Amino acid sequence: SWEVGCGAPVPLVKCDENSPYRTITGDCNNRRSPALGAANRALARWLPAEYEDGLALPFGWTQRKTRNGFRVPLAREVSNKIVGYLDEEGVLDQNRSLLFMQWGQIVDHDLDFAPETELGSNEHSKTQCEEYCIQGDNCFPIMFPKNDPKLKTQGKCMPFFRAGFVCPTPPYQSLAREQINAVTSFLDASLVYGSEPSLASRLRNLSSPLGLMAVNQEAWDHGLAYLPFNNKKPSPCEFINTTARVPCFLAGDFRASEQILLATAHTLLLREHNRLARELKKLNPHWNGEKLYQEARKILGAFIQIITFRDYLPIVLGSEMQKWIPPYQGYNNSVDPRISNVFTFAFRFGHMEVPSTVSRLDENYQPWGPEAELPLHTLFFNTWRIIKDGGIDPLVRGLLAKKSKLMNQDKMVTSELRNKLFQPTHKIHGFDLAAINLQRCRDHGMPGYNSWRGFCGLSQPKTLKGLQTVLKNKILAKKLMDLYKTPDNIDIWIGGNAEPMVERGRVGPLLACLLGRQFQQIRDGDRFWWENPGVFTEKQRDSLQKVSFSRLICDNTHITKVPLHAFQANNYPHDFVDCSTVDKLDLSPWASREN
Numbered sequence: 001s002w003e004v005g006c007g008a009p010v011p012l013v014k015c016d017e018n019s020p021y022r023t024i025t026g027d028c029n030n031r032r033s034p035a036l037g038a039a040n041r042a043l044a045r046w047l048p049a050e051y052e053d054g055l056a057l058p059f060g061w062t063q064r065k066t067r068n069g070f071r072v073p074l075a076r077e078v079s080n081k082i083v084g085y086l087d088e089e090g091v092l093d094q095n096r097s098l099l100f101m102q103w104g105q106i107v108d109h110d111l112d113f114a115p116e117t118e119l120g121s122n123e124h125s126k127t128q129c130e131e132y133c134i135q136g137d138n139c140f141p142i143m144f145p146k147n148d149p150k151l152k153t154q155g156k157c158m159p160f161f162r163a164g165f166v167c168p169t170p171p172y173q174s175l176a177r178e179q180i181n182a183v184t185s186f187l188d189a190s191l192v193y194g195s196e197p198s199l200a201s202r203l204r205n206l207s208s209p210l211g212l213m214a215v216n217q218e219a220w221d222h223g224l225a226y227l228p229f230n231n232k233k234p235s236p237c238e239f240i241n242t243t244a245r246v247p248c249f250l251a252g253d254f255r256a257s258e259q260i261l262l263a264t265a266h267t268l269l270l271r272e273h274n275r276l277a278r279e280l281k282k283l284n285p286h287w288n289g290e291k292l293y294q295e296a297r298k299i300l301g302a303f304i305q306i307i308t309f310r311d312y313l314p315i316v317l318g319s320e321m322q323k324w325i326p327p328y329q330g331y332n333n334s335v336d337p338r339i340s341n342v343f344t345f346a347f348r349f350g351h352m353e354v355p356s357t358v359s360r361l362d363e364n365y366q367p368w369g370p371e372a373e374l375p376l377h378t379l380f381f382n383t384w385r386i387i388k389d390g391g392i393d394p395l396v397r398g399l400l401a402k403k404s405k406l407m408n409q410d411k412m413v414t415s416e417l418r419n420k421l422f423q424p425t426h427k428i429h430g431f432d433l434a435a436i437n438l439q440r441c442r443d444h445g446m447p448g449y450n451s452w453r454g455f456c457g458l459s460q461p462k463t464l465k466g467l468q469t470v471l472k473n474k475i476l477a478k479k480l481m482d483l484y485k486t487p488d489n490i491d492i493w494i495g496g497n498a499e500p501m502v503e504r505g506r507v508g509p510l511l512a513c514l515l516g517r518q519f520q521q522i523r524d525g526d527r528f529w530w531e532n533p534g535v536f537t538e539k540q541r542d543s544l545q546k547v548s549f550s551r552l553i554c555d556n557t558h559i560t561k562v563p564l565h566a567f568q569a570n571n572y573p574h575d576f577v578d579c580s581t582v583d584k585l586d587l588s589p590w591a592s593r594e595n
């Protein structure tokens with residue numbers, strides 16, 4: 001045989017079989033295979049990787065080398081011809097709040113992160129990849145097609161660095177290249193606590209014995225906590241306004257400041273940890289700092305699991321929810337809890353749910369000041385609009401009262417992401433998330449659309465007429481055939497997102513299958529699943545059943561009017577109630593009696 005386990009990186013398996021709490025790394029969840037679901041290991045392969053050279057080089061790397069007899073089209077040309085639209089009118093989701101989009105990004109960041117390889121440390125190809133657009137090693141530039149307006153204003157290419165891969169990065173490995181998942185595959189609030197012991201300790205307040213997370217000591221939100229600043233340079237949150245000089249936040253996850261509403265959600269979860277820890281200290285004054293942090297951490301993880309599986313997944317998967325995620329039947333230690341490489345592209349359906357603007361709303365849910373509504377691109381790596389523009393509350397009102405973008409076959413990704421994305425160290429609001437997604441599919445050796453259709457037991461269209469029937473769209477099928485030539489070559493991100501949405505859902509059949517299977521595994525394969533008998537007492541579970549995003553807002557802001565169903569499209573004041581009428585989390589079942 002060949003390498004049965006290339007695990008030279010992170011070989012430390014020191015598991016306490018008795019511990020009632022998760023590790024920060026995800027190790028020790030599975031007793032028989034303790035690294036399963038742990039951070040800093042390979043993404044799972046549900047199907048074999050598909051590279052140009054069978055091992056590592058992406059389809060599209062070598063100009064002459066076809067996929068199935070056809071050249072793969074430029075990611076940016078696919079973005080321009082299929083993904084782009086001008087008219088934002090009529091694009092909003094009449095039955096999903098903006099919080100529906102934002103929760104999807106939060107869950108995705110809990111589950112997976114494939115960071116760009118670190119060969120840019122005091123390196124030219126950091127700026128040389130950008131400067132000279134020369135493909136090589138980890139530089140895999142997104143080249144502009146001839147008619148691209150960006151060819152006129154931005155040079156020959158958008159820089160793009162190949163994702164990190166296991167059995168270290170600069171040299172070869174054991175058959176095909178496997179990209180890393182840098183976070184824990186468990187739905188475990190790793191995005192609040194970190195997936196690495198160093199970060200996890202840095203985020204804690206070890207000054208007091210109260211099991212608190214560290215909070216900003218330079219700025220307060222009407223006496224409510226902010227995340228600490230990340231005091232490291234260069235900072236993209238500083239770069240986007242050098243007058244305000246407000247740094248990025250430091251959170252459990254590297255990406256927390258990518259946009260202002262992610263930073264907002266991260267702020268609510270930090271507040272909630274410190275709140276739970278304070279309540280537990282009252283009930284159990286005998287509890288030390290560690291105990292308080294672990295018990296609060298375990299409650300926040302449960303909160304995230306319930307909102308996700310009870311409130312969010314049903315209104316993503318629609319009719320397909322029951323097919324893929326049956327009612328829970330307990331922990332199955334034969335289930336692979338690892339996030340799959342393909343899932344990390346399937347969950348990018350959220351890119352098509354991001355609308356072009358973000359609003360700040362006042363306490364009457366009316367525009368907050370003269371520039372209440374802002375273009376999303378001005379809010380990438382933007383903490384100063386929080387610190388110096390009325391805190392998170394007006395943004396949280398926006399999350400409740402404003403709508404997600406609806407996916408549309410003729411209006412896929414707003415230009416705010418498709419033409420104006422800002423990437424750290426790159427200096428301009430000029431990148432294309434759609435093109436990045438297609439290039440990344442190829443970077444990760446993704447099987448094409450029809451391989452995934454076959455994996456999901458769905459038809460594999462071979463012709464224009466077959467693709468028209470699957471997509472229920474003749475113009476969309478024609479553009480995809482003109483670019484790809486055969487449906488076998490369609491990159492999974494665009495092919496899954498092109499399918500019309502399932503009844504009561506927000507993704508098509510192929511994505512429902514891939515997402516559904518992944519979520520089934522992360523629940524069934526988790527020893528610490530909130531509803532796994534023994535994790536919580538039956539009384540704790542009866543209290544946990546009452547959590548809501550609504551209560552989270554009431555407890556962790558100066559917002560007093562909230563909807564009951566925060567992911568539905570809700571209009572003020574008709575759909576809003578006082579916080580008074582909203583179920584609280586009763587922590588009394590956490591009262592710990594030895595005497």
Ligand code: HEM
Binds near residue numbers: 259344354436437
């Ligand atoms: C304004 C909102 C958002 C921004 C600016 C944004 C930005 C990004 C960027 C720059 C990447 C990395 C692309 C790459 O290098 O390959 C990314 C990845 C991703 N995004 Fe988004 N995104 C947004 C919203 C969302 C939403 C709403 C979802 C899900 C519902 C989502 C899910 C993902 C996932 C799953 C990944 C891959 C994570 C990994 O394994 O590395 N994003 N996003």
Ligand SMILES: *[C@@H]1O[C@H](CO)[C@@H](O[C@@H]2O[C@H](CO)[C@@H](O)[C@H](O)[C@H]2NC(C)=O)[C@H](O)[C@H]1NC(C)=O
Binds near residue numbers: 240384
């Ligand atoms: C950079 O951030 C500064 C600091 O907030 C912004 O300035 C505010 O600017 C407007 C003028 O357009 C004033 O009405 C506010 O009252 C200002 N507040 C303070 C404390 O200066 C500035 O707009 C930002 N610039 C950019 C390009 O984002």
Ligand SMILES: *[C@@H]1O[C@H](CO)[C@@H](O)[C@H](O)[C@H]1NC(C)=O
Binds near residue numbers: 207210213214216
């Ligand atoms: C740590 O907690 C103490 C106790 O409340 C608090 O006064 C102090 O500011 C905190 N330090 C940080 C960095 O959060």
Ligand SMILES: *[C@@H]1O[C@H](CO)[C@@H](O)[C@H](O)[C@H]1NC(C)=O
Binds near residue numbers: 332334335
């Ligand atoms: C446990 O998971 C395995 C592999 O996925 C599956 O075959 C088996 O049916 C599962 N056990 C139960 C009781 O569902």
Ligand SMILES: [Ca+2]
Binds near residue numbers: 111184186187190191
């Ligand atoms: Ca996690």
Ligand SMILES: [Zn+2]
Binds near residue numbers: 222558
């Ligand atoms: Zn206030």
